[PDB]
Amino acid sequence: MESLLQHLDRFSELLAVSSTTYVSTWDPATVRRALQWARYLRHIHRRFGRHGPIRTALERRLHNQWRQEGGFGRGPVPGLANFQALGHCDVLLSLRLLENRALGDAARYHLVQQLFPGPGVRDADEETLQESLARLARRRSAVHMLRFNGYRENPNLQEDSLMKTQAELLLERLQEVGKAEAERPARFLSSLWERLPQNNFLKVIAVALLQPPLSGEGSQVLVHWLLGNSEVFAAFCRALPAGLLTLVTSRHPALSPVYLGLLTDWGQRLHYDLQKGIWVGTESQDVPWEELHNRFQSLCQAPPPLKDKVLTALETCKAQDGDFEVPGLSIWTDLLLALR
Amino acid sequence: PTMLPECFFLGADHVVKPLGIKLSRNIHLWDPENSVLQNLKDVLEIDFPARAILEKSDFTMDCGICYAYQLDGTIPDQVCDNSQCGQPFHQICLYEWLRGLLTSRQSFNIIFGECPYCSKPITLKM
């Protein structure tokens, strides 16, 4: 049990330095030692990797490693990301050494000769490293070929295949932080928000809010994070399309009263011009009539639990601004007229 | 006609087996100078019933698409709202059928369409 800690952390240090350009002192001995250690970890993962204290100990070690590093400053080093990557650690190491230009000639030769010995060893009991890399090359080729011959960006994002993949990764990555309980998930998400591209991230959150559970604590965390952070939710509802927000809001009733409140504030900063029969905003970043109509139409074309909510929120905002029944006076009368 | 026909048996696997056996053993006794009934009776060594039930003879209670009972646990449950058809279906068969036709329109969990046999309004709730 304790024997595996010094094995795994040492291997992780060796792995992390694998990608780094200090390779001068390396030799066949170092490479042989690396790959036999990696075989040992891949053997552990097979033997007693499931349903024991050892699995959870290794997960504690891995996730504690990935949060003590954090991903700030001195190095945004990946590391082996999770316990499943224990079963293919050797492949990571080999790939990193093949990408390191700074590798020495004899090390390179010994490496590649140990990865790809040839068909001298066509008969093997354990799925070896050569087969693993071949299967990887096939998959990478398959992915390229499907992406550029048959794939289409589906408009119903929740049914897309990229967004669904990113989403499942995010959910798994939140589950591990939850089990760790070291730092709160909201801090990870806030750091992500600064770090990576916002437009992409928001579509991904939207999509992860709708994937059914597989262990919905993941979605349960993101709703709390969003309701806590108003600024992101201002761009959440603003950037995405209509039906996605509608399905999100119908799935999570806690997002409904704020969303209508966001829309209710965007109408109020419009002004009607008599010459062109169109509501418009003063500032350029004020939502147009067409987009706002689309949002309310999607909300009305929804389950009954939300239809009455939006309808009452519109009537109460109409009567608040004079209970007119004629256009040119109230954006809310004009909405309710256009819905029918 | 009076010559031997291609003939076989439907029903219970425990009841049908001795009938196939007896047919195999006695099939050489067929003679095309008598009648079909007068040969079948002494071949299978039995007599027939004359309309044991004349009213409830049989109503085919099968999918009316796949013509099977027991498609993957499912039963013929979805029926026609019609006195003249009354034809059962399965959820899966009737969904695959109605999702094709041009007349059909899908609400949230509902599809309205025409019953295959009689072309009357039939509703399917998934």
């Binding site: 590649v112 040839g118 998959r139 499907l146 992406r147 | 050489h28």
Partner: protein, 550 residues
């Protein structure tokens, strides 16, 4: 050890001049042509690997001129790099071209270039940008999400095909057939990747509403080859769909059964049965289109050869499989036998379907004697409202083993006063298209032979020359087979079988014929559960020793 360079140096220029045309295969025609020629490229690469393996790098200049360009063009084409082992061999060849100790700077540049192309193969992010950014941010490497990514793309596409299929004639977005054909071209190199079989299975099941085919026959040939070599493992609905929308693939399947009975597994009927059952042809032949095509090929073969025992025994096996699949999966709404066997009277088939497992061993005689009556009526009284001819009734009667083979073994049991109807059936079996004048002479010859053989059996254990006398024409195969059944039946056998077998096996054809006889006979016995262990061990020993002589 004659040529060693020339044919390979020609194929080289061929392939390099083809790769330069292909060039990453971003269009339709490049893709189709790659999908055609890729296999020969694989073999070319095996030969090139042997050549570079036996020798070393940087010293020799045989094909070192453009080997770089060849292996690069190969590598940047992904229809090559996704075929069975092409990637593995290109990796091997690049490993051969490397050098441990570079001396001139050109060799170092080469080694760097090799690392570059290897890195392009394994670990380059030639994909959408934001997904790479997002994953890199979350600290995921390509190796720990590509599988799920592939899986999710495949499920997406497969669902899309299913929904385009269900929306037949509906006011909705129709999956553009360019995309379907594109996926069908992509499935061809990576048919043996388990992570794609859903997409294959979906393409086959989701024919859709078009009058023309949208898939091109390279897809079907690929899938069929893989099904028959046991490299994909689809379900049966998909291989029926395949047969039933590409007819040359069902012919190509039935040929692959003939090589097994002509070349590989002559007279190992257990292996023939195993192949037939693992194959889907019995299950698929419950569609009458496919049974009609299969029997038409059996017929062509019965005619090219003049009644080969090997094809005859194979048909008997196929028919048994087909029967016990028709019964299983034809409960409600089954087709009438005149739909499978449309060239005969249904009476006769309905007799011959009846298995002899169901009947007592003693009541086989009556049933055969009845079958003889029906065949004689159908042939001799060839009037309107009957078979097309004698050959048709024969070709049927041959489909149902048990009956056709049991004839002689019942003659020996009743060799005292042989039944004329059985003699007729036997003469019909070994020769139709003979005429009554020929048939009578044949039957009386057989009757005299049965008299002599019964005399010899009720006598003591006697020689083989007394049998070779009667063995000594148009009725030779019949007498040979009858005499073999005499050997296996009489207890006077297991002493003088060799003495007759050696004399009869002049050629190798007679040896193959006797082997076929004995394999068929043991299959027959082990099936019907009828056995005398003397005859079993005798036949097994003779078969064992004669399979060496051939």
């Amino acid at each position: 050890m004659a040529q060693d360079s020339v044919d390979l140096s020609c194929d080289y220029q061929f392939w390099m001049q083809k790769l330069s045309v292909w060039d990453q295969a971003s269009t339709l025609e490049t893709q189709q042509d790659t999908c055609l020629h890729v296999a020969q490229f694989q073999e070319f690469l095996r030969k090139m690997y042997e050549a570079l393996k036996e020798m070393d790098s940087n010293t020799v200049i045989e094909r070192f001129p453009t080997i770089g360009q060849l292996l690069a063009k190969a590598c940047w084409n992904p229809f090559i790099l996704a075929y069975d082992e092409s990637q593995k061999i290109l990796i091997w060849c690049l490993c051969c071209l490397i050098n441990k100790e570079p001396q001139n700077s050109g060799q170092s540049k080469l080694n760097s270039w090799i690392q570059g192309v290897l890195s392009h193969i394994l670990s380059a992010l030639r994909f959408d940008k934001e997904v790479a950014l997002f994953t890199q941010g979350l600290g995921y490497a390509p190796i720990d999400y590509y599988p799920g990514l592939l899986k999710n793309m495949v499920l997406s596409l497969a669902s899309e095909l299913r929904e385009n299929h269900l929306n037949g004639f509906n006011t909705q977005r129709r999956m553009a057939p360019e995309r379907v054909a594109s996926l069908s071209r992509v499935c061809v190199p990576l048919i043996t990747l388990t992570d794609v079989d859903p997409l294959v299975e979906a393409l086959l099941i989701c024919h859709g509403r078009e009058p023309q085919e949208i898939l091109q026959p390279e897809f079907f040939e690929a899938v069929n080859e893989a099904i028959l070599l046991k490299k994909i493992s689809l379900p049966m609905s998909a291989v029926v769909c395949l047969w039933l929308r590409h007819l040359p693939s069902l012919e190509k399947a039935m040929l692959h059964l003939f090589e097994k009975l002509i070349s590989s597994e002559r007279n190992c009927l257990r292996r023939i049965e195993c192949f037939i059952k693992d194959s889907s042809l019995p299950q698929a032949a419950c569609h009458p289109a496919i049974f009609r095509v299969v029997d038409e090929m059996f017929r062509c073969a019965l005619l090219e050869t003049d009644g080969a025992l090997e094809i005859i025994a194979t048909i008997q096996v196929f028919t048994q499989c087909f029967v016990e699949a028709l019964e299983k999966a034809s409960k409600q709404l089954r087709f009438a036998l005149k739909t499978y066997f449309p060239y005969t009277s249904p009476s006769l088939a309905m007799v011959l379907l009846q298995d002899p497992q169901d009947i007592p061993r003693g009541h086989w005689l009556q049933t055969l004697k009845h079958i003889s009556e029906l065949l004689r009526e159908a042939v001799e009284d060839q009037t309107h409202g009957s078979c097309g001819g004698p050959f048709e009734s024969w070709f049927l009667f041959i489909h149902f083993g048990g009956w056709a083979e049991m004839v002689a073994e019942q003659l020996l049991m009743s060799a005292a006063e042989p039944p004329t109807a059985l003699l007729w059936l036997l003469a019909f079996y070994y020769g139709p298209r003979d005429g009554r004048q020929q048939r009578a002479q044949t039957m009386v010859q057989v009757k005299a032979v049965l008299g002599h053989l019964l005399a010899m059996s009720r006598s003591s254990s006697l020689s083989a020359q007394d049998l070779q006398t009667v063995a000594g024409a148009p009725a030779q195969q019949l007498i040979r087979h009858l005499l073999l059944n005499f050997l296996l039946w009489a207890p006077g056998g297991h002493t003088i079988a060799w003495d007759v077998i050696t004399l009869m096996a002049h050629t190798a054809e007679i040896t193959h014929e006797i082997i076929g006889f004995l394999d068929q006979t043991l299959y027959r016995w082990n099936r019907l559960g009828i056995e005398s262990p003397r005859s079993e061990k005798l036949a097994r020993e003779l078969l064992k020793e004669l399979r060496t002589q051939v």
